[PDB]
Paper text:
For simplicity, we mainly focused on KCC3 for structural analysis. KCC3 exists as a dimer in domain-swapping conformation. The TM domain and CTD are connected through a pair of scissor helices, which separate the two TM domains from different protomers resulting in a unique “Central Cleft” between TM domains at the cytosolic side. The extracellular domain (ECD) of the two protomers are placed in distance. Both TM domains, scissor helices and CTD are involved in dimerization of the transporter. The TM domain of KCC3 is captured in an inward-facing conformation, sharing the LeuT-fold as the members of the amino acids, polyamines and organocations (APC) superfamily, with TMs 3–5 and 8–10 forming the scaffold domain and TMs 1, 2, 6 and 7 constituting the bundle domain. A marked difference is observed in the C-terminal domain (CTD) compared with Danio rerio Na+-K+ Cl− cotransporter 1 (DrNKCC1), which rotates ~70° clockwise as seen from cytosolic side when transmembrane (TM) domains aligned together. A unique “L” shape N-terminal loop (residues N100–N120) is bound to the entry of the cytosolic vestibule of the transporter, which can be divided into an N lobe and a C lobe. The C lobe, which extends along TM8 and approaches CTD, is stabilized through salt bridges E116-K549 and E119-R886, as well as hydrophilic interaction between H115 and F203 from IL23. The binding locks the transporter in inward-facing state, prohibits the conformation change of the transporter.
Residue numbers in the entry:
A (entry chain B), B (entry chain A): 100 to 120, 133 to 972, 994 to 1000, 1030 to 1099
């Protein structure tokens, strides 16, 4: 009996900072979520929701509203099993899993939702006070005339504000005493639901005998009358009753002069509660939507027809109803599911208790609502259900007459259950606004975090006593209920959206480790919160989705100013960092290669660009899309030449826009040229957005003399590039390359494919041909095969491969001896299966294994060294078959062989590359990195 | 007379590729925009829009719709004066200024809008054929009964499809002949508008005398009758007329038996067109909304009251109307403003002709519409206006009876003006879909670019003949017109939004050089297109805004796969590049500093991190927000140690997540340690997102012996950092710094502010105190002043400065002689006004010039060298006043002096820093870069 610390209230602040310096599933998450869902609609308005619209349509109102908040409880459960479940309640659990910017626009839509909920229970409690307890202490009891609902809304205003100012005084003084009495308010709800189920089984054996007077197809107000037969015999003195005096002039006048409907259509008396035995459910299955001011009447009765006059004794339809109006009245029942996580600081295992405690509390209350819809339409008369305030049963609760001990067990029971749910919302709403006043995410809400000596917000209570006071001057509980259901549907939408939006775009710290969670359930439960929001008002849903969007972008602007200094510039800095951090986790090793480029520009003396045509050819290859980095090296000391490094970056960036290159500049000052180039190749980019291919020019003038520095810098750059596993594009005779405004009228582009790098040698003429300059050229492809292979099948297969990819080229094979391509065919099968050992890695069927050009070509099958039965790697037989067909061809692409395994062959390697490209105008040498698989040619 | 190449048609493709290998304002932009705006609503339906709803509300329908498309013509004009105005029409002018992804969802909403416009003119042309020309060649002329509109919709289906299949055959064969006759269709519209203004001035002197028969407060169908007096005297043989035979049984029966309304309520005859003279405008100022099936009747007539029976001779209200229905019917009038730019390939100055030609064509047609609303309600009888098909005026056009020569000048004139506007939309819609089939932005629309030998799309015409054919089977012109106004409002919304969205976020290539353009005009004209879209249907506006949004994200996904290889990974690569390119243009030199950080980690042998506590202190300073780069250097050769560089990056990144650091790793292999460190300081980042502050550890053990390398690497790093104008944070005794889980219970943080770097020395304890570890400490600030300054005013002013910023520290001043702070006070006024020469730069009042701590402190006012009347820079008097107050203080922040101007003083500089920080546990030495102004302390 020592578990008296039940405390269904909210955690909030002052219990979050103490955790930065137990309970179970039943007493911690299940029971606080059960107490905050049951409210006033189950007692005051559920009989009116079944009576209007019948059983078959009130079953669809509850089932739509309960499945809307069930699918939100799965997204709310996936939040609790993602992080490390911080201890502050529901605001701190969302603002760390969904980050900021969904703390606001969820915490602010939750603060307005519970502030108008506190004005709804107070308006609900005065209605149980002015009716059903003391219908004698009204203030504005005007005379009986055509207006009395306007005289009822004035009594709710003067008693409502006097009831709000007394509950605010309780929370400001005795908040430790509203916390100890949380188990007393829970006992008033459980014994009231059991009192309804007791009497609905009793009524199958003994109905409670509540009578109602009917004039015949018209229902009369049972108050102000005594007998139900219009005769009122005392003893053989037949003075007519009070019922005669309302329809006629006065008594003692059995002659004549009464109304037309009264002289026919006899006065009878039927049963108000026939019980579960007699099948009255066949009359309550159908709808009864009527306009305001009509008469509540039943079928299976008797009525002449002679029209009559309206009297102040019938029962009247109070408001005009529809299907869309009853959804907004019933929806504050199912709200309250965020009360499963408001005791997150005391659970022993708060990640397996919160999902199973919230979901099982939804099935409990949705079973009480769905079973009471059937058990009201099958026990109570249709004319007793189709009116509020119970004027046909002498002024009782319609749900109260069904109960077994008394009607007073629900009247006095749902009065403390209503005042208890109002004190909870009036103390959990200032504890939420005090939390958003912390963390400094909204700067003009800074004054509302002004805690006393122990928690207990001061100025946050004065707004909640002033916005709920605006919900009191609006009387009429049927009007305040569609207002607060717009706010709770607004915060259920953003939780369901942000959970599905983060598991699709692969947000970095989001792994919802939880069974029975998918991205489709948070999306199916997002379309239902949008459907119920539009059919309510549609002009208070559009304007409540933009101020929940204008408060979204205000947090991101203010959150970037405190992070990156200023405002608008910080928005682009935070969007670039978040996109870069997402790039680190995806299985790299992509299977659609694309060149990125790193253009190495040589600067001479006077700090000018030596080959400005390299930026022009880099622009024609990329055509303005993708990443392009331009790198340069100034030889000198940085402590003296730092002013010359800033001026040299301006002339490169000015040349960069004259050649239409979209990219970045990267200049460095090094002591040696070979060291500064080697550092630019391995340290450019910011992770993920790094380069892929190095592009440099040919060293024109290496055969000069006395200067091993000019050509050993080139071989050193090739060796660094092939060690970092990058591609290499070397352009020879770059000064004869075309400008951006010259446009070759006709010509060829010849590709000499030699055993290796097949995919890269077909993508590069394809990307170049979709430019203004190289548009009218045509692609010719020459493949070098050997005598042992099948040249007939290789020609028939490469032509079949280009047909399925829409390339529009022509293929011709040429066979050469093994003593002529020995620089290429030597290191094959050391590295060829090394490409096979890497080919698999990921998944790839045969519809994509027949799109790689190297794989479709590979259906085939005395020493030779680089240094001086030992012969040198010659190229005089390979060049004369290239220049025999590829002269006057405007561009020649051919793959270059690798450098030797050791030095003492570097000058023989430069002489191999000089006699290979002898007699061609524009040559582009290609070297593959090793890992380049291309399956889609744009 | 040689200007016969008028050609109001669309440019499209085949005239865009020819410009990659004149006309004026009147004949090029003004007149083609004037011909495509005037249509069928001005002739067939404008009299019905004035008759219903009166003059005062039909004036508000035109003024709302014309100002909606005027504000779009300003955003469309700002597009044409931004780029270099490409030559392809309106699709190529938008898809280059707004980029891609607004080419689609604007070009696709424009293609559907003109396809349903071609079904509207064809349905409009059959109505001028079946009525008003030959009401004898119908097919489904059913018997006169309660349904005849259903017998009218079947005649529009079988003649509509036979008229669509003949105009498709014209465009496929004779598109050069529909282009030459563009001036002939323009002449049929201009002489028809002048024929209306001629007769409306003639009617002030001589009305055209069109009579209409009235039974008295009831309007009769004037066809099928001959006389209007129900007597029909031939010669003294009073046989009753045809009017008697419709209401009674038959003729020759002057006795009795006719209806109740016919025996009273005499037959009269009023004027159909009284003219501009008699003030009939006082009866047409007000609304006449009526349900379907009511009788058109006028006030100021005579009617008994005796109800009657409905006859097949009255005129009936055909459809039920509202205010929102008439907006969707009138709105296809003002559409067509994109026809100003469809001749952009032939204008001589296409940037000053398109804005002044489009805007002046809007004022012309909006003057014809606004003046004809007043000139119809003041000339024509209200019962002739309030019906279509003209059955009260013997079957004429209601606009035709007002004209001066004949009613036939409008009937035969608006038949060729309607067929001419239908052939234009049936040839400009396949030319648009053929353009979006090019550029490969949508891959499953690839088959519809299948041009013949000269342009002329084949398969694109077969969709336009199949979607407009779906608009023919839907008959009833009043229903097709709200469908196409939903598409034209959908593409006017995206042009107005993207013009205002790009001039707010500062998109790089967007400078709309044009007078009278603001971002507020494109936003005011965006709320009007949203207002007219929601009041039309609201369930065909929400579903037409998501499929225009699902086609938005499909282009960005497909546009990133062809750019970055694969799909989802490419979306983050393109978002990071676009955010980085926006960062290059904004005036740098921000005025709210924030440390970015570059942590230099020393690796020893075995390739481990020597000081792993530097990553922990870097995490406590940044707290997970901002950019943090970790840099390391491996000493060796990259061609051998490239496998060890990949493994060393894994252990750094694994240590990086154990200390909760969000950032990037950057490791390099250099030959020397000093060269690789110097390159990391000047070449990290990618432009804009670069570092701001270098953080390194103190060289513990430099006083060892034989190893000038350990401490000259430190002074070299300080000299490189102060030459690149960066800040420096040196941490001494980093192994005694706290971990992330230890949390000092109480203590101080002492800041020793010495003459310089005032703003940085107050931000760093503020950012450190908002962490878990340094939360409970308190900040003490010691400022060093001189004897000549005012210590009393400096104490009173620094305490006033911290009050207005919410810092919660305490300030105490200490005065020292000039022979003790000589290492600090020496190079002041060489660099102090250099800070003043940079202070201004941007704008800054006094409310922010009193928030910089160095500026509020500056209200104040024998040789000493670094090498050996010449004394050394000593620190034995400065240290004993720091250690007298800042021992047991848990952190000491003090600014360090600069290195000497030359070497031969480097070892005296390391000995100055050793005796300065003698006897303190944790010291952090701060050095300002020179350009650090802080005005907002978070
Ligand atoms: C209730 O009203 C009905 C008629 O509205 C009365 O029914 C009549 O009863 C008498 C007596 O048996 C019959 O002769 C008549 O034929 C009934 N009328 C009809 C239309 O069937 C009945 O009397 C009224 N009830 C009372 C108690 O007076
Ligand atoms: C209550 O009585 C009224 C009138 O006596 C009923 O309305 C009549 O319904 C019948 C169809 O059964 C119509 O033919 C009459 O024209 C209606 N009369 C009037 C005046 O409306 C009404 O149906 C009765 N209520 C119920 C629930 O049956
Ligand atoms: C038109 O109808 C009106 C009544 O609806 C007829 O007006 C009557 O005319 C006679 C002849 O002067 C008067 O004595 C009556 O007083 C008029 N009636 C009223 C109510 O004022 C009129 O005769 C009809 N027109 C014709 C041509 O017969
Ligand atoms: C056409 O005639 C009808 C009936 O004669 C007019 O309707 C009457 O309007 C008066 C108000 O002036 C009412 O008091 C009557 O009750 C109405 N009678 C009916 C049967 O509706 C109607 O106003 C006339 N039309 C116009 C334009 O005045
Ligand atoms: C009337 O009632 C009284 C008492 O109920 C009785 O004494 C008297 O006899 C009755 N009269 C008749 C005529 O029944
Ligand atoms: C009531 O009785 C009086 C007196 O005969 C009579 O004048 C009056 O009209 C009656 N009331 C009604 C409503 O008929
Ligand atoms: C009737 O009309 C005819 C010709 O209009 C005329 O000759 C005859 O006299 C008329 N009769 C009377 C009675 O007016
Ligand atoms: C027309 O006349 C015939 C013959 O007298 C009569 O039976 C019939 O009812 C009349 N028509 C009407 C509509 O009264
Ligand atoms: Cl409730
Ligand atoms: Cl909730
Ligand atoms: Cl039109
Ligand atoms: Cl348009």
């Amino acid at each position: 009996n020592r578990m008296a610390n039940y405390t269904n209230l909210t955690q909030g602040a002052k219990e979050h900072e103490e955790a930065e310096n137990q309970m179970g599933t039943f007493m911690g998450v299940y029971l606080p979520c059960l107490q905050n869902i049951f409210g006033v609609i189950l007692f005051l308005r559920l009989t009116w929701v079944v009576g209007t619209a019948g059983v078959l349509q009130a079953f669809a109102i509850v089932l739509i509203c309960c499945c809307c908040t069930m699918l939100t409880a799965i997204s709310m459960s996936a939040i609790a099993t993602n992080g490390v479940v911080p201890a502050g309640g529901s605001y701190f659990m969302i603002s760390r899993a969904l980050g900021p910017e969904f703390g606001g626009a969820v915490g602010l839509c939750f603060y307005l939702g519970t502030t108008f909920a506190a004005a709804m229970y107070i308006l609900g409690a005065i209605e149980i006070f002015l009716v059903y307890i003391v219908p004698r202490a009204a203030i504005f009891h005007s005379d009986d005339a055509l207006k009395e609902s306007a005289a009822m809304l004035n009594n709710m205003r003067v008693y409502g504000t006097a009831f709000l100012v007394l509950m605010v005084l309780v929370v400001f003084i005795g908040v430790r005493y509203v916390n100890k009495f949380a188990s007393l308010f829970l006992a008033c709800v459980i014994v009231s639901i059991l009192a309804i189920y007791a009497g609905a089984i009793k009524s199958s054996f003994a109905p409670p005998h509540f009578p109602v007077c009917m004039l015949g197809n018209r229902t009369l107000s049972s108050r102000h009358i005594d007998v139900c037969s219009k005769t009122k015999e005392i003893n053989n003195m037949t003075v007519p009753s009070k019922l005669w005096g309302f329809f006629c002039n006065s008594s003692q006048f059995f002659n004549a002069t009464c109304d037309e409907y009264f002289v026919h259509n006899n006065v009878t008396s039927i049963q108000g509660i026939p019980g579960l035995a007699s099948g009255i459910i066949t009359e309550n299955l159908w709808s009864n939507y009527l306009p305001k001011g009509e008469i509540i009447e039943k079928p299976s009765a008797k009525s002449s027809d002679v029209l009559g006059s309206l009297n102040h004794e019938y029962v009247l339809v109070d408001i005009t109803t529809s299907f869309t109006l009853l959804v907004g009245i019933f929806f504050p029942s199912v709200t309250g599911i965020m009360a499963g996580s408001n005791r997150s600081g005391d659970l022993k295992d708060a990640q397996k208790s919160i999902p199973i405690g919230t979901i099982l509390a939804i099935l409990t209350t949705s079973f009480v609502y769905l079973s009471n819809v059937v058990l009201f339409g099958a026990c109570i008369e249709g004319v007793v259900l189709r009116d509020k305030f119970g004027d046909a049963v002498k002024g009782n609760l319609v749900v109260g007459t069904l109960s077994w001990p008394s009607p007073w067990v629900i009247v006095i029971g749902s009065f403390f259950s209503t005042c208890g749910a109002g004190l909870q919302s009036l103390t959990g709403a200032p504890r939420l606004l005090q939390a958003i006043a912390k963390d400094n995410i909204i700067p003009f809400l800074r004054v509302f975090g002004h805690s006393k000596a122990n928690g207990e917000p001061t100025w946050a209570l004065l707004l909640t006593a002033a916005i709920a006071e605006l919900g009191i001057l609006i009387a009429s509980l049927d009007l305040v209920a569609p207002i607060l259901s717009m706010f709770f549907l607004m915060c259920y939408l953003f939780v369901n959206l942000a959970c599905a939006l983060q598991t699709l775009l692969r947000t970095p710290n989001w792994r919802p480790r939880f069974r029975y969670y998918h991205w489709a359930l948070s999306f199916m439960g997002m379309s239902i919160c949008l459907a119920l929001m539009f059919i309510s008002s549609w002009y208070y849903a559009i304007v409540a989705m933009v101020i929940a969007g204008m408060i979204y972008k205000y947090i991101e602007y203010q959150g970037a100013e405190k992070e990156w200094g200023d405002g608008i510039r910080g928005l682009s800095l935070s969007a670039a960092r978040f996109a870069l951090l997402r790039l680190e986790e995806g299985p790299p090793h992509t299977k659609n290669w694309r060149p990125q480029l790193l253009v190495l520009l040589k600067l001479d003396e006077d700090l000018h660009v030596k080959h400005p045509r390299l930026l022009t050819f880099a622009s024609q290859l990329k055509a303005g899309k993708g990443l392009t980095i331009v790198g340069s090296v100034i030889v000198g000391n940085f402590l003296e030449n730092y002013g010359e490094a800033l001026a040299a970056e301006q002339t490169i960036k000015h040349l960069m826009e004259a050649e239409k290159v979209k990219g970045f500049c990267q200049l460095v000052v090094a002591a040696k040229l070979r060291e500064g180039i080697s550092h630019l190749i391995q340290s450019c980019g910011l992770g993920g957005m790094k380069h892929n291919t190095v592009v440099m020019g040919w060293p024109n003038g290496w055969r000069q003399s006395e200067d091993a520095r000019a050509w050993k810098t080139f071989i050193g750059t090739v060796r660094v590039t092939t060690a970092a596993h990058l591609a290499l594009l070397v352009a020879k005779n770059i000064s004869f390359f075309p400008s951006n405004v010259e446009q070759f009228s006709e010509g060829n582009i010849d590709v000499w494919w030699i055993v290796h790098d097949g995919g890269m040698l077909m993508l590069l003429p394809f990307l170049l041909k979709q430019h203004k300059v190289w548009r009218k050229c045509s692609i010719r492809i020459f493949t070098v095969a050997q005598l042992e292979d099948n040249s007939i099948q290789m020609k028939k297969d490469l032509a079949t491969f280009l047909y399925h990819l829409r390339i529009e080229a022509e293929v011709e094979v040429v066979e050469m001896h093994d003593s002529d391509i020995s620089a290429y065919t030597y290191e094959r099968t050391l590295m060829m299966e090394q490409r096979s050992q890497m080919l698999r890695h990921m998944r790839l069927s045969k519809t994509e294994r027949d799109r790689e050009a190297q794989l479709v070509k590979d259906r085939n099958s005395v020493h030779m060294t680089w240094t001086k039965v030992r012969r040198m790697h010659t190229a005089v037989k390979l060049n004369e078959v290239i220049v025999n067909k590829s002269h006057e061809a405007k561009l020649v692409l051919l793959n270059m062989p690798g450098p030797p395994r050791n030095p003492e062959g570097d000058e023989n390697y430069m002489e191999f590359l000089e006699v290979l490209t002898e007699g061609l105008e524009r040559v582009l040498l290609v070297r593959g990195g090793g890992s380049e698989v291309i399956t889609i040619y744009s």
